[PDB]
Design a protein around this ligand. Structure first.
Ligand SMILES: OB(O)c1ccccc1
Ligand SMILES: [Mn+2]
Ligand SMILES: [Mn+2]
Lengths: 137, 137
Protein backbone atom coordinates (compact mmCIF):
# COMPACT_ATOMS: atom_id res chain seq x y z
CA UNK A 1 0.00 0.00 0.00
CA UNK A 2 1.00 3.65 0.19
CA UNK A 3 3.27 4.37 3.14
CA UNK A 4 3.73 8.15 3.38
CA UNK A 5 5.09 11.10 1.45
CA UNK A 6 8.07 10.10 -0.67
CA UNK A 7 8.86 13.70 -1.62
CA UNK A 8 7.39 17.17 -1.98
CA UNK A 9 8.27 18.99 -5.20
CA UNK A 10 7.74 22.74 -5.42
CA UNK A 11 7.91 24.52 -8.76
CA UNK A 12 10.00 27.67 -8.45
CA UNK A 13 10.46 30.61 -10.80
CA UNK A 14 14.01 31.55 -9.72
CA UNK A 15 16.16 28.74 -8.37
CA UNK A 16 18.77 30.66 -6.38
CA UNK A 17 16.38 32.74 -4.21
CA UNK A 18 14.31 29.65 -3.51
CA UNK A 19 17.34 27.59 -2.48
CA UNK A 20 18.40 30.47 -0.24
CA UNK A 21 14.93 30.65 1.33
CA UNK A 22 14.71 26.96 2.20
CA UNK A 23 18.38 26.46 3.13
CA UNK A 24 19.46 29.77 4.67
CA UNK A 25 16.24 31.15 6.09
CA UNK A 26 14.39 27.95 7.00
CA UNK A 27 17.51 25.93 7.86
CA UNK A 28 16.87 22.89 5.70
CA UNK A 29 19.79 20.76 4.56
CA UNK A 30 20.94 21.28 0.97
CA UNK A 31 22.20 18.04 -0.60
CA UNK A 32 22.58 18.93 -4.27
CA UNK A 33 21.85 21.74 -6.72
CA UNK A 34 21.92 21.76 -10.53
CA UNK A 35 20.94 24.14 -13.28
CA UNK A 36 17.23 23.30 -13.00
CA UNK A 37 16.68 22.18 -9.41
CA UNK A 38 17.80 21.35 -5.91
CA UNK A 39 17.34 18.55 -3.38
CA UNK A 40 16.99 19.40 0.30
CA UNK A 41 15.91 17.54 3.38
CA UNK A 42 14.01 18.64 6.46
CA UNK A 43 14.21 15.79 8.92
CA UNK A 44 12.84 12.85 6.97
CA UNK A 45 11.22 15.08 4.31
CA UNK A 46 12.74 15.02 0.83
CA UNK A 47 12.09 18.44 -0.71
CA UNK A 48 12.74 19.07 -4.38
CA UNK A 49 12.82 22.58 -5.81
CA UNK A 50 12.21 22.39 -9.56
CA UNK A 51 12.87 25.37 -11.81
CA UNK A 52 9.69 25.76 -13.85
CA UNK A 53 9.10 28.58 -16.38
CA UNK A 54 5.37 28.07 -15.73
CA UNK A 55 5.63 28.98 -12.03
CA UNK A 56 4.13 32.36 -11.25
CA UNK A 57 4.68 34.45 -8.17
CA UNK A 58 1.18 34.14 -6.79
CA UNK A 59 -0.44 36.44 -4.23
CA UNK A 60 -2.21 34.51 -1.48
CA UNK A 61 -5.65 35.87 -2.35
CA UNK A 62 -5.24 34.27 -5.82
CA UNK A 63 -4.41 30.75 -4.62
CA UNK A 64 -6.51 28.20 -2.78
CA UNK A 65 -5.86 26.86 0.72
CA UNK A 66 -3.40 24.13 -0.37
CA UNK A 67 -0.42 24.46 1.97
CA UNK A 68 2.61 22.73 3.45
CA UNK A 69 3.28 22.71 7.19
CA UNK A 70 6.65 22.02 8.82
CA UNK A 71 7.07 20.67 12.33
CA UNK A 72 8.73 22.76 15.02
CA UNK A 73 8.93 22.28 18.75
CA UNK A 74 6.98 24.30 21.29
CA UNK A 75 10.28 25.70 22.58
CA UNK A 76 11.43 26.95 19.16
CA UNK A 77 8.12 28.03 17.58
CA UNK A 78 7.77 31.65 18.69
CA UNK A 79 11.34 32.77 18.10
CA UNK A 80 11.42 31.15 14.63
CA UNK A 81 8.14 32.84 13.68
CA UNK A 82 9.42 36.18 15.00
CA UNK A 83 12.64 35.82 13.02
CA UNK A 84 10.66 35.23 9.82
CA UNK A 85 8.55 38.31 10.61
CA UNK A 86 11.61 40.45 11.25
CA UNK A 87 13.13 39.23 7.97
CA UNK A 88 10.08 40.55 6.11
CA UNK A 89 8.61 37.20 5.11
CA UNK A 90 5.08 37.71 3.79
CA UNK A 91 2.12 36.11 5.48
CA UNK A 92 -1.16 34.71 4.40
CA UNK A 93 -3.15 33.86 7.51
CA UNK A 94 -3.47 35.05 11.10
CA UNK A 95 -6.35 33.13 12.72
CA UNK A 96 -5.18 29.97 14.50
CA UNK A 97 -7.91 27.62 13.35
CA UNK A 98 -5.81 24.44 13.70
CA UNK A 99 -3.67 25.04 16.78
CA UNK A 100 -0.30 26.72 17.22
CA UNK A 101 0.65 27.76 13.69
CA UNK A 102 2.44 30.55 11.83
CA UNK A 103 1.43 31.03 8.18
CA UNK A 104 3.98 32.44 5.75
CA UNK A 105 4.77 32.56 2.03
CA UNK A 106 7.81 31.42 0.05
CA UNK A 107 9.24 33.64 -2.70
CA UNK A 108 6.76 32.28 -5.27
CA UNK A 109 3.79 32.45 -2.94
CA UNK A 110 3.74 28.79 -1.95
CA UNK A 111 1.70 28.67 1.24
CA UNK A 112 3.81 27.43 4.14
CA UNK A 113 3.19 26.95 7.84
CA UNK A 114 5.08 26.30 11.06
CA UNK A 115 3.01 24.04 13.31
CA UNK A 116 3.50 22.62 16.79
CA UNK A 117 1.87 19.24 17.33
CA UNK A 118 1.01 15.88 15.78
CA UNK A 119 -2.20 14.60 14.21
CA UNK A 120 -2.95 12.71 17.42
CA UNK A 121 -2.62 15.94 19.41
CA UNK A 122 -4.84 17.81 16.94
CA UNK A 123 -7.52 15.12 17.17
CA UNK A 124 -7.43 15.31 20.97
CA UNK A 125 -7.75 19.10 20.86
CA UNK A 126 -10.61 18.81 18.37
CA UNK A 127 -12.56 16.51 20.65
CA UNK A 128 -12.78 19.44 23.08
CA UNK A 129 -13.09 22.20 20.46
CA UNK A 130 -14.36 20.38 17.39
CA UNK A 131 -14.81 21.82 13.95
CA UNK A 132 -18.47 22.17 12.96
CA UNK A 133 -20.02 18.77 12.28
CA UNK A 134 -16.92 16.82 13.26
CA UNK A 135 -17.00 13.02 13.45
CA UNK A 136 -14.11 10.87 14.68
CA UNK A 137 -13.42 7.40 13.31
CA UNK B 1 14.79 24.09 13.88
CA UNK B 2 12.34 22.39 11.54
CA UNK B 3 12.07 18.65 12.05
CA UNK B 4 9.98 17.41 9.10
CA UNK B 5 6.74 17.81 7.23
CA UNK B 6 3.98 18.29 9.77
CA UNK B 7 1.05 18.02 7.35
CA UNK B 8 0.02 18.43 3.74
CA UNK B 9 -3.25 20.25 3.13
CA UNK B 10 -5.01 19.98 -0.21
CA UNK B 11 -7.82 22.34 -1.11
CA UNK B 12 -10.72 20.40 -2.61
CA UNK B 13 -13.82 21.54 -4.47
CA UNK B 14 -16.10 18.68 -3.33
CA UNK B 15 -15.36 16.86 -0.10
CA UNK B 16 -17.13 13.55 -0.75
CA UNK B 17 -15.31 12.59 -3.99
CA UNK B 18 -11.99 13.65 -2.49
CA UNK B 19 -12.55 11.50 0.60
CA UNK B 20 -13.55 8.61 -1.67
CA UNK B 21 -10.36 9.08 -3.70
CA UNK B 22 -7.88 9.29 -0.82
CA UNK B 23 -9.57 6.81 1.54
CA UNK B 24 -11.17 4.20 -0.71
CA UNK B 25 -9.11 4.32 -3.92
CA UNK B 26 -5.71 5.20 -2.43
CA UNK B 27 -6.23 3.32 0.84
CA UNK B 28 -5.43 6.09 3.31
CA UNK B 29 -6.85 5.99 6.83
CA UNK B 30 -9.70 8.41 7.55
CA UNK B 31 -9.44 9.73 11.11
CA UNK B 32 -12.02 12.52 11.16
CA UNK B 33 -14.36 14.48 8.93
CA UNK B 34 -16.27 17.70 9.47
CA UNK B 35 -18.51 19.86 7.34
CA UNK B 36 -15.54 21.50 5.59
CA UNK B 37 -12.71 18.99 5.67
CA UNK B 38 -11.15 15.70 6.65
CA UNK B 39 -8.01 14.33 8.28
CA UNK B 40 -6.35 11.21 6.87
CA UNK B 41 -3.04 9.48 7.42
CA UNK B 42 -0.76 7.60 5.04
CA UNK B 43 2.11 6.14 7.02
CA UNK B 44 3.68 9.13 8.81
CA UNK B 45 1.91 11.60 6.50
CA UNK B 46 -0.88 13.71 7.99
CA UNK B 47 -3.11 14.73 5.09
CA UNK B 48 -5.83 17.35 5.44
CA UNK B 49 -8.51 17.80 2.80
CA UNK B 50 -9.96 21.30 3.11
CA UNK B 51 -13.19 22.18 1.32
CA UNK B 52 -12.47 25.43 -0.51
CA UNK B 53 -14.83 27.07 -3.02
CA UNK B 54 -11.76 28.78 -4.51
CA UNK B 55 -10.36 25.43 -5.63
CA UNK B 56 -10.65 25.08 -9.41
CA UNK B 57 -10.68 21.68 -11.10
CA UNK B 58 -7.42 22.38 -12.90
CA UNK B 59 -6.22 20.69 -16.09
CA UNK B 60 -2.58 19.57 -15.82
CA UNK B 61 -1.50 21.85 -18.69
CA UNK B 62 -2.70 24.79 -16.57
CA UNK B 63 -0.79 24.05 -13.38
CA UNK B 64 2.92 24.12 -12.69
CA UNK B 65 5.10 21.13 -11.76
CA UNK B 66 4.41 21.28 -8.01
CA UNK B 67 3.48 17.74 -7.00
CA UNK B 68 3.16 15.28 -4.13
CA UNK B 69 4.75 11.82 -4.31
CA UNK B 70 3.70 8.88 -2.12
CA UNK B 71 5.96 5.95 -1.29
CA UNK B 72 5.15 2.43 -2.41
CA UNK B 73 7.29 -0.68 -2.60
CA UNK B 74 8.60 -1.90 -5.94
CA UNK B 75 6.67 -5.13 -5.41
CA UNK B 76 3.34 -3.29 -4.99
CA UNK B 77 3.86 -0.59 -7.64
CA UNK B 78 2.45 -2.28 -10.75
CA UNK B 79 -0.77 -3.49 -9.15
CA UNK B 80 -1.43 -0.07 -7.61
CA UNK B 81 -0.86 1.62 -10.96
CA UNK B 82 -3.27 -0.88 -12.52
CA UNK B 83 -5.86 -0.07 -9.83
CA UNK B 84 -5.63 3.62 -10.69
CA UNK B 85 -5.92 2.79 -14.38
CA UNK B 86 -9.00 0.63 -13.80
CA UNK B 87 -10.57 3.55 -11.91
CA UNK B 88 -9.92 5.82 -14.90
CA UNK B 89 -7.47 8.08 -13.08
CA UNK B 90 -5.65 10.35 -15.52
CA UNK B 91 -1.87 10.35 -15.95
CA UNK B 92 -0.10 13.68 -16.36
CA UNK B 93 3.47 12.56 -17.22
CA UNK B 94 5.49 9.49 -18.20
CA UNK B 95 8.42 8.32 -16.09
CA UNK B 96 11.88 9.15 -17.48
CA UNK B 97 13.92 9.24 -14.22
CA UNK B 98 15.40 6.62 -11.88
CA UNK B 99 13.04 4.66 -9.70
CA UNK B 100 9.56 3.62 -10.70
CA UNK B 101 7.12 6.53 -10.86
CA UNK B 102 3.44 6.78 -11.82
CA UNK B 103 2.16 10.35 -12.29
CA UNK B 104 -1.57 10.73 -11.69
CA UNK B 105 -4.16 13.40 -10.98
CA UNK B 106 -6.60 13.76 -8.09
CA UNK B 107 -10.22 14.81 -8.70
CA UNK B 108 -9.29 18.52 -8.58
CA UNK B 109 -6.16 18.14 -10.67
CA UNK B 110 -3.66 18.02 -7.83
CA UNK B 111 -0.53 16.44 -9.29
CA UNK B 112 0.33 13.20 -7.51
CA UNK B 113 2.96 10.52 -7.98
CA UNK B 114 3.71 7.00 -6.79
CA UNK B 115 7.49 6.67 -6.40
CA UNK B 116 9.82 3.84 -5.44
CA UNK B 117 13.10 5.04 -3.99
CA UNK B 118 14.60 7.38 -1.42
CA UNK B 119 16.59 10.59 -1.58
CA UNK B 120 19.70 8.53 -0.86
CA UNK B 121 18.99 6.33 -3.89
CA UNK B 122 18.45 9.38 -6.08
CA UNK B 123 21.65 11.04 -4.87
CA UNK B 124 23.65 7.86 -5.51
CA UNK B 125 22.35 7.72 -9.09
CA UNK B 126 23.09 11.42 -9.56
CA UNK B 127 26.65 11.05 -8.30
CA UNK B 128 27.27 8.45 -11.01
CA UNK B 129 25.48 10.49 -13.70
CA UNK B 130 25.18 14.11 -12.59
CA UNK B 131 22.59 16.41 -14.06
CA UNK B 132 23.80 19.46 -15.95
CA UNK B 133 25.45 21.88 -13.55
CA UNK B 134 25.14 19.53 -10.60
CA UNK B 135 27.03 20.21 -7.38
CA UNK B 136 26.86 18.15 -4.19
CA UNK B 137 27.15 19.38 -0.61
O1 LIG C 1 26.14 27.81 -3.65
B1 LIG C 1 26.19 28.29 -4.92
O2 LIG C 1 26.50 29.59 -5.14
C1 LIG C 1 25.93 27.31 -6.12
C2 LIG C 1 25.62 27.79 -7.40
C3 LIG C 1 25.41 26.92 -8.46
C4 LIG C 1 25.51 25.56 -8.27
C5 LIG C 1 25.81 25.06 -7.03
C6 LIG C 1 26.03 25.92 -5.96
MN1 LIG D 1 -2.13 23.72 8.17
MN1 LIG E 1 8.47 13.63 -8.29
Amino acid sequence: MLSGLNHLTLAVSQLAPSVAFYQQLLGMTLHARWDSGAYLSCGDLWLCLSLDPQRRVTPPEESDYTHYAFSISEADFASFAARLEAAGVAVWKLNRSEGASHYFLDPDGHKLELHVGSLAQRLAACREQPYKGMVFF
